[PDB]
Backbone as JSON Lines, residues from 0, in Angstrom:
{"i":0,"aa":"X","n":[4.58,-51.03,-8.34],"ca":[4.69,-52.01,-7.21],"c":[3.59,-51.65,-6.2]}
{"i":1,"aa":"X","n":[3.3,-52.59,-5.35],"ca":[2.28,-52.41,-4.32],"c":[2.59,-51.18,-3.48]}
{"i":2,"aa":"X","n":[1.56,-50.35,-3.25],"ca":[1.75,-49.2,-2.39],"c":[1.88,-49.6,-0.94]}
{"i":3,"aa":"X","n":[2.45,-48.72,-0.13],"ca":[2.56,-49.03,1.32],"c":[1.15,-49.14,1.92]}
{"i":4,"aa":"X","n":[0.21,-48.31,1.5],"ca":[-1.15,-48.4,2.03],"c":[-1.78,-49.73,1.68]}
{"i":5,"aa":"X","n":[-1.56,-50.19,0.43],"ca":[-2.15,-51.45,0.01],"c":[-1.48,-52.62,0.76]}
{"i":6,"aa":"X","n":[-0.18,-52.53,0.97],"ca":[0.48,-53.6,1.72],"c":[-0.03,-53.63,3.15]}
{"i":7,"aa":"X","n":[-0.33,-52.48,3.77],"ca":[-0.92,-52.49,5.1],"c":[-2.23,-53.24,5.1]}
{"i":8,"aa":"X","n":[-3.11,-52.96,4.09],"ca":[-4.38,-53.66,4.05],"c":[-4.2,-55.16,3.92]}
{"i":9,"aa":"X","n":[-3.29,-55.58,3.02],"ca":[-3.08,-56.99,2.79],"c":[-2.49,-57.68,4.03]}
{"i":10,"aa":"X","n":[-1.55,-57.02,4.7],"ca":[-0.92,-57.64,5.83],"c":[-1.73,-57.6,7.1]}
{"i":11,"aa":"X","n":[-2.58,-56.56,7.27],"ca":[-3.1,-56.29,8.6],"c":[-4.59,-56.15,8.71]}
{"i":12,"aa":"X","n":[-5.35,-56.05,7.63],"ca":[-6.79,-55.88,7.76],"c":[-7.54,-57.19,7.56]}
{"i":13,"aa":"X","n":[-8.5,-57.47,8.42],"ca":[-9.45,-58.55,8.14],"c":[-10.86,-58.1,8.56]}
{"i":14,"aa":"X","n":[-11.46,-57.31,7.68],"ca":[-12.82,-56.84,7.88],"c":[-13.87,-57.92,7.66]}
{"i":15,"aa":"X","n":[-13.46,-59.1,7.19],"ca":[-14.35,-60.2,6.86],"c":[-14.74,-61.07,8.02]}
{"i":16,"aa":"X","n":[-14.06,-60.94,9.15],"ca":[-14.35,-61.73,10.32],"c":[-14.3,-60.84,11.54]}
{"i":17,"aa":"X","n":[-15.03,-61.22,12.59],"ca":[-15.06,-60.35,13.77],"c":[-13.98,-60.72,14.78]}
{"i":18,"aa":"X","n":[-13.35,-61.86,14.66],"ca":[-12.32,-62.38,15.53],"c":[-11.79,-63.65,14.86]}
{"i":19,"aa":"X","n":[-10.7,-64.19,15.4],"ca":[-10.23,-65.47,14.95],"c":[-11.14,-66.58,15.4]}
{"i":20,"aa":"X","n":[-11.53,-67.46,14.47],"ca":[-12.51,-68.49,14.78],"c":[-11.92,-69.82,15.23]}
{"i":21,"aa":"X","n":[-10.61,-69.99,15.11],"ca":[-9.98,-71.23,15.49],"c":[-8.51,-70.99,15.64]}
{"i":22,"aa":"X","n":[-7.83,-72.03,16.17],"ca":[-6.4,-71.98,16.31],"c":[-5.67,-72.0,14.99]}
{"i":23,"aa":"X","n":[-6.34,-72.32,13.89],"ca":[-5.71,-72.32,12.59],"c":[-5.85,-70.98,11.86]}
{"i":24,"aa":"X","n":[-6.49,-69.97,12.49],"ca":[-6.7,-68.69,11.78],"c":[-5.39,-68.16,11.24]}
{"i":25,"aa":"X","n":[-4.37,-68.04,12.09],"ca":[-3.13,-67.46,11.63],"c":[-2.48,-68.3,10.55]}
{"i":26,"aa":"X","n":[-2.43,-69.62,10.76],"ca":[-1.83,-70.45,9.72],"c":[-2.45,-70.19,8.36]}
{"i":27,"aa":"X","n":[-3.78,-70.11,8.34],"ca":[-4.51,-69.93,7.1],"c":[-4.3,-68.5,6.53]}
{"i":28,"aa":"X","n":[-4.43,-67.49,7.39],"ca":[-4.36,-66.1,6.92],"c":[-2.96,-65.67,6.56]}
{"i":29,"aa":"X","n":[-1.94,-66.12,7.33],"ca":[-0.6,-65.8,6.97],"c":[-0.27,-66.35,5.58]}
{"i":30,"aa":"X","n":[-0.78,-67.55,5.3],"ca":[-0.58,-68.15,3.98],"c":[-1.35,-67.38,2.91]}
{"i":31,"aa":"X","n":[-2.65,-67.16,3.14],"ca":[-3.53,-66.58,2.13],"c":[-3.15,-65.15,1.75]}
{"i":32,"aa":"X","n":[-2.61,-64.4,2.69],"ca":[-2.16,-63.02,2.45],"c":[-0.72,-62.97,1.96]}
{"i":33,"aa":"X","n":[-0.13,-64.14,1.66],"ca":[1.2,-64.24,1.07],"c":[2.3,-63.77,1.98]}
{"i":34,"aa":"X","n":[2.08,-63.94,3.3],"ca":[3.06,-63.55,4.28],"c":[4.03,-64.69,4.6]}
{"i":35,"aa":"X","n":[3.84,-65.84,4.01],"ca":[4.72,-66.98,4.19],"c":[5.34,-67.39,2.89]}
{"i":36,"aa":"X","n":[5.18,-66.58,1.82],"ca":[5.59,-67.05,0.49],"c":[7.1,-67.21,0.35]}
{"i":37,"aa":"X","n":[7.85,-66.22,0.78],"ca":[9.29,-66.18,0.62],"c":[10.07,-66.62,1.87]}
{"i":38,"aa":"X","n":[9.46,-66.41,3.03],"ca":[9.99,-66.71,4.32],"c":[8.82,-66.65,5.3]}
{"i":39,"aa":"X","n":[8.98,-67.23,6.48],"ca":[7.94,-67.14,7.47],"c":[7.98,-65.79,8.14]}
{"i":40,"aa":"X","n":[7.01,-64.89,7.88],"ca":[7.0,-63.63,8.62],"c":[6.91,-63.94,10.11]}
{"i":41,"aa":"X","n":[7.73,-63.44,11.01],"ca":[7.76,-63.93,12.39],"c":[6.55,-63.59,13.24]}
{"i":42,"aa":"X","n":[6.03,-62.38,13.06],"ca":[4.96,-61.8,13.88],"c":[4.07,-61.02,12.95]}
{"i":43,"aa":"X","n":[2.77,-61.01,13.21],"ca":[1.87,-60.19,12.4],"c":[0.57,-60.04,13.16]}
{"i":44,"aa":"X","n":[-0.07,-58.89,13.05],"ca":[-1.37,-58.65,13.64],"c":[-2.41,-58.39,12.57]}
{"i":45,"aa":"X","n":[-3.58,-58.99,12.74],"ca":[-4.73,-58.7,11.91],"c":[-5.78,-57.93,12.74]}
{"i":46,"aa":"X","n":[-6.44,-56.97,12.1],"ca":[-7.41,-56.1,12.75],"c":[-8.8,-56.4,12.17]}
{"i":47,"aa":"X","n":[-9.72,-56.8,13.05],"ca":[-11.08,-57.2,12.67],"c":[-12.03,-56.02,12.85]}
{"i":48,"aa":"X","n":[-11.85,-55.03,11.97],"ca":[-12.63,-53.81,11.98],"c":[-12.85,-53.39,10.55]}
{"i":49,"aa":"X","n":[-13.74,-52.43,10.33],"ca":[-13.85,-51.85,9.0],"c":[-12.56,-51.12,8.64]}
{"i":50,"aa":"X","n":[-12.31,-51.06,7.34],"ca":[-11.18,-50.32,6.86],"c":[-11.26,-48.84,7.25]}
{"i":51,"aa":"X","n":[-12.43,-48.22,7.1],"ca":[-12.53,-46.82,7.45],"c":[-12.23,-46.57,8.91]}
{"i":52,"aa":"X","n":[-12.62,-47.48,9.8],"ca":[-12.35,-47.27,11.22],"c":[-10.86,-47.34,11.52]}
{"i":53,"aa":"X","n":[-10.13,-48.19,10.79],"ca":[-8.68,-48.27,10.98],"c":[-7.98,-47.07,10.34]}
{"i":54,"aa":"X","n":[-8.42,-46.68,9.12],"ca":[-7.84,-45.51,8.49],"c":[-8.03,-44.25,9.35]}
{"i":55,"aa":"X","n":[-9.15,-44.19,10.07],"ca":[-9.46,-43.03,10.92],"c":[-8.43,-42.89,12.04]}
{"i":56,"aa":"X","n":[-7.7,-43.94,12.39],"ca":[-6.71,-43.83,13.47],"c":[-5.65,-42.78,13.13]}
{"i":57,"aa":"X","n":[-5.44,-42.52,11.81],"ca":[-4.47,-41.51,11.4],"c":[-4.85,-40.08,11.83]}
{"i":58,"aa":"X","n":[-6.09,-39.89,12.3],"ca":[-6.46,-38.6,12.87],"c":[-6.75,-38.69,14.37]}
{"i":59,"aa":"X","n":[-6.2,-39.71,15.03],"ca":[-6.41,-39.93,16.46],"c":[-5.16,-39.51,17.23]}
{"i":60,"aa":"X","n":[-4.71,-40.26,18.24],"ca":[-3.7,-39.72,19.19],"c":[-2.3,-39.9,18.65]}
{"i":61,"aa":"X","n":[-1.63,-38.8,18.3],"ca":[-0.27,-38.93,17.79],"c":[0.64,-39.49,18.89]}
{"i":62,"aa":"X","n":[1.57,-40.37,18.49],"ca":[2.58,-40.91,19.38],"c":[3.75,-41.34,18.5]}
{"i":63,"aa":"X","n":[4.96,-41.24,19.02],"ca":[6.11,-41.7,18.27],"c":[6.06,-43.21,18.13]}
{"i":64,"aa":"X","n":[6.42,-43.7,16.94],"ca":[6.55,-45.1,16.66],"c":[7.71,-45.72,17.46]}
{"i":65,"aa":"X","n":[7.73,-47.06,17.52],"ca":[8.87,-47.76,18.12],"c":[10.19,-47.26,17.61]}
{"i":66,"aa":"X","n":[10.28,-47.04,16.27],"ca":[11.55,-46.64,15.65],"c":[11.82,-45.14,15.75]}
{"i":67,"aa":"X","n":[10.98,-44.4,16.47],"ca":[11.17,-43.0,16.71],"c":[10.42,-42.07,15.75]}
{"i":68,"aa":"X","n":[9.94,-42.56,14.65],"ca":[9.18,-41.73,13.69],"c":[8.02,-41.08,14.42]}
{"i":69,"aa":"X","n":[7.63,-39.88,13.96],"ca":[6.58,-39.14,14.63],"c":[5.25,-39.2,13.94]}
{"i":70,"aa":"X","n":[5.15,-40.04,12.92],"ca":[3.88,-40.2,12.19],"c":[3.1,-41.42,12.61]}
{"i":71,"aa":"X","n":[3.17,-41.84,13.91],"ca":[2.35,-42.9,14.48],"c":[1.19,-42.28,15.24]}
{"i":72,"aa":"X","n":[0.14,-43.1,15.35],"ca":[-1.1,-42.73,15.99],"c":[-1.67,-43.94,16.69]}
{"i":73,"aa":"X","n":[-2.16,-43.71,17.91],"ca":[-2.86,-44.72,18.7],"c":[-4.37,-44.48,18.58]}
{"i":74,"aa":"X","n":[-5.1,-45.59,18.4],"ca":[-6.54,-45.53,18.36],"c":[-7.06,-45.08,19.72]}
{"i":75,"aa":"X","n":[-8.14,-44.27,19.68],"ca":[-8.81,-43.92,20.9],"c":[-9.53,-45.09,21.49]}
{"i":76,"aa":"X","n":[-10.03,-46.0,20.67],"ca":[-10.78,-47.14,21.18],"c":[-10.02,-48.42,20.99]}
{"i":77,"aa":"X","n":[-10.41,-49.44,21.78],"ca":[-9.91,-50.77,21.55],"c":[-10.57,-51.33,20.28]}
{"i":78,"aa":"X","n":[-9.86,-52.27,19.67],"ca":[-10.29,-52.96,18.47],"c":[-10.09,-54.46,18.66]}
{"i":79,"aa":"X","n":[-10.89,-55.27,17.95],"ca":[-10.68,-56.7,17.9],"c":[-9.5,-56.99,17.0]}
{"i":80,"aa":"X","n":[-8.49,-57.69,17.55],"ca":[-7.31,-58.04,16.81],"c":[-6.96,-59.49,17.06]}
{"i":81,"aa":"X","n":[-6.17,-60.01,16.12],"ca":[-5.55,-61.33,16.28],"c":[-4.05,-61.15,16.14]}
{"i":82,"aa":"X","n":[-3.35,-61.62,17.19],"ca":[-1.89,-61.67,17.15],"c":[-1.47,-63.02,16.62]}
{"i":83,"aa":"X","n":[-0.55,-63.0,15.65],"ca":[0.0,-64.2,15.05],"c":[1.52,-64.17,15.33]}
{"i":84,"aa":"X","n":[2.04,-65.26,15.86],"ca":[3.49,-65.35,16.01],"c":[3.9,-66.79,15.84]}
{"i":85,"aa":"X","n":[5.1,-66.96,15.28],"ca":[5.53,-68.32,14.93],"c":[5.56,-69.23,16.15]}
{"i":86,"aa":"X","n":[5.15,-70.47,15.93],"ca":[5.36,-71.53,16.9],"c":[6.82,-71.99,16.85]}
{"i":87,"aa":"X","n":[7.21,-72.73,17.89],"ca":[8.55,-73.28,17.91],"c":[8.83,-74.23,16.76]}
{"i":88,"aa":"X","n":[7.8,-74.89,16.24],"ca":[7.94,-75.82,15.14],"c":[7.9,-75.2,13.75]}
{"i":89,"aa":"X","n":[7.6,-73.92,13.65],"ca":[7.54,-73.27,12.34],"c":[8.84,-73.42,11.6]}
{"i":90,"aa":"X","n":[8.78,-73.9,10.35],"ca":[9.99,-74.13,9.58],"c":[9.6,-74.0,8.1]}
{"i":91,"aa":"X","n":[10.08,-72.97,7.44],"ca":[9.77,-72.72,6.04],"c":[9.95,-73.98,5.2]}
{"i":92,"aa":"X","n":[9.05,-74.31,4.27],"ca":[7.87,-73.57,3.86],"c":[6.62,-73.83,4.67]}
{"i":93,"aa":"X","n":[6.82,-74.71,5.7],"ca":[5.71,-75.06,6.59],"c":[5.74,-74.12,7.79]}
{"i":94,"aa":"X","n":[5.4,-72.88,7.52],"ca":[5.26,-71.82,8.49],"c":[4.07,-72.11,9.41]}
{"i":95,"aa":"X","n":[4.21,-71.9,10.7],"ca":[3.23,-72.24,11.67],"c":[3.17,-71.17,12.75]}
{"i":96,"aa":"X","n":[1.96,-70.89,13.2],"ca":[1.68,-69.75,14.05],"c":[0.74,-70.09,15.18]}
{"i":97,"aa":"X","n":[0.95,-69.41,16.28],"ca":[0.02,-69.37,17.4],"c":[-0.91,-68.18,17.18]}
{"i":98,"aa":"X","n":[-2.2,-68.45,17.27],"ca":[-3.26,-67.45,17.15],"c":[-3.7,-67.02,18.55]}
{"i":99,"aa":"X","n":[-3.66,-65.71,18.81],"ca":[-4.13,-65.18,20.07],"c":[-5.13,-64.05,19.8]}
{"i":100,"aa":"X","n":[-6.31,-64.22,20.39],"ca":[-7.36,-63.21,20.33],"c":[-7.1,-62.09,21.33]}
{"i":101,"aa":"X","n":[-7.46,-60.85,20.92],"ca":[-7.37,-59.81,21.91],"c":[-8.23,-58.63,21.51]}
{"i":102,"aa":"X","n":[-8.44,-57.72,22.46],"ca":[-9.11,-56.46,22.19],"c":[-8.2,-55.38,22.75]}
{"i":103,"aa":"X","n":[-7.54,-54.67,21.86],"ca":[-6.43,-53.78,22.19],"c":[-6.55,-52.5,21.38]}
{"i":104,"aa":"X","n":[-5.93,-51.43,21.87],"ca":[-5.7,-50.26,21.01],"c":[-4.63,-50.64,20.01]}
{"i":105,"aa":"X","n":[-4.66,-50.03,18.85],"ca":[-3.65,-50.19,17.84],"c":[-2.86,-48.89,17.64]}
{"i":106,"aa":"X","n":[-1.61,-49.08,17.22],"ca":[-0.74,-47.97,16.85],"c":[-0.26,-48.26,15.43]}
{"i":107,"aa":"X","n":[-0.49,-47.28,14.55],"ca":[-0.14,-47.39,13.13],"c":[0.65,-46.15,12.73]}
{"i":108,"aa":"X","n":[1.49,-46.3,11.71],"ca":[2.13,-45.17,11.07],"c":[1.34,-44.79,9.83]}
{"i":109,"aa":"X","n":[1.24,-43.5,9.54],"ca":[0.42,-42.98,8.46],"c":[1.24,-42.1,7.52]}
{"i":110,"aa":"X","n":[0.86,-42.14,6.25],"ca":[1.48,-41.32,5.22],"c":[0.47,-41.05,4.12]}
{"i":111,"aa":"X","n":[0.76,-40.01,3.35],"ca":[0.06,-39.81,2.1],"c":[-1.05,-38.79,2.16]}
{"i":112,"aa":"X","n":[-1.65,-38.62,0.96],"ca":[-2.88,-37.83,0.83],"c":[-3.79,-38.61,-0.09]}
{"i":113,"aa":"X","n":[-4.81,-39.32,0.37],"ca":[-5.27,-39.34,1.75],"c":[-4.27,-39.93,2.73]}
{"i":114,"aa":"X","n":[-4.33,-39.43,3.98],"ca":[-3.39,-39.8,5.03],"c":[-3.91,-41.11,5.66]}
{"i":115,"aa":"X","n":[-3.2,-42.2,5.38],"ca":[-3.7,-43.53,5.69],"c":[-2.58,-44.39,6.29]}
{"i":116,"aa":"X","n":[-2.98,-45.52,6.91],"ca":[-1.95,-46.37,7.54],"c":[-1.08,-47.03,6.49]}
{"i":117,"aa":"X","n":[0.21,-47.07,6.81],"ca":[1.22,-47.73,6.0],"c":[2.03,-48.75,6.76]}
{"i":118,"aa":"X","n":[1.87,-48.84,8.09],"ca":[2.64,-49.76,8.9],"c":[1.85,-50.01,10.19]}
{"i":119,"aa":"X","n":[1.86,-51.25,10.64],"ca":[1.29,-51.61,11.94],"c":[2.41,-51.63,12.94]}
{"i":120,"aa":"X","n":[2.33,-50.76,13.94],"ca":[3.44,-50.64,14.9],"c":[3.25,-51.51,16.13]}
{"i":121,"aa":"X","n":[2.09,-51.55,16.72],"ca":[1.9,-52.25,18.0],"c":[0.43,-52.37,18.32]}
{"i":122,"aa":"X","n":[0.12,-53.38,19.13],"ca":[-1.14,-53.47,19.83],"c":[-0.83,-53.11,21.29]}
{"i":123,"aa":"X","n":[-1.61,-52.29,21.98],"ca":[-1.36,-51.82,23.34],"c":[-2.62,-51.65,24.2]}
């Protein structure tokens, strides 16, 4: 089955674009990354950085995750991100999202050897 690291990349990385280019970014990306296949994922963040720069966050500032786990890390620098969250009209299978651009630090949980992101915790 898909590894947690691979699911992080599929759900949260977009190294192919530097920012969201339109209000339809989330609608398109949530669909294309299969985040709307079974149900409308309510919230999701995409990170417009290289994969190595995001993986490097696992050696940056340790902080406890929202759920209390101690394997979270905050990026030292801000990153280009897109926040996706359902619109009021979103209704499966026609999942619909508001796209919001931002430049924020990210917090990710890390596991493994190599020690890499497995969960996106927050933009801050």
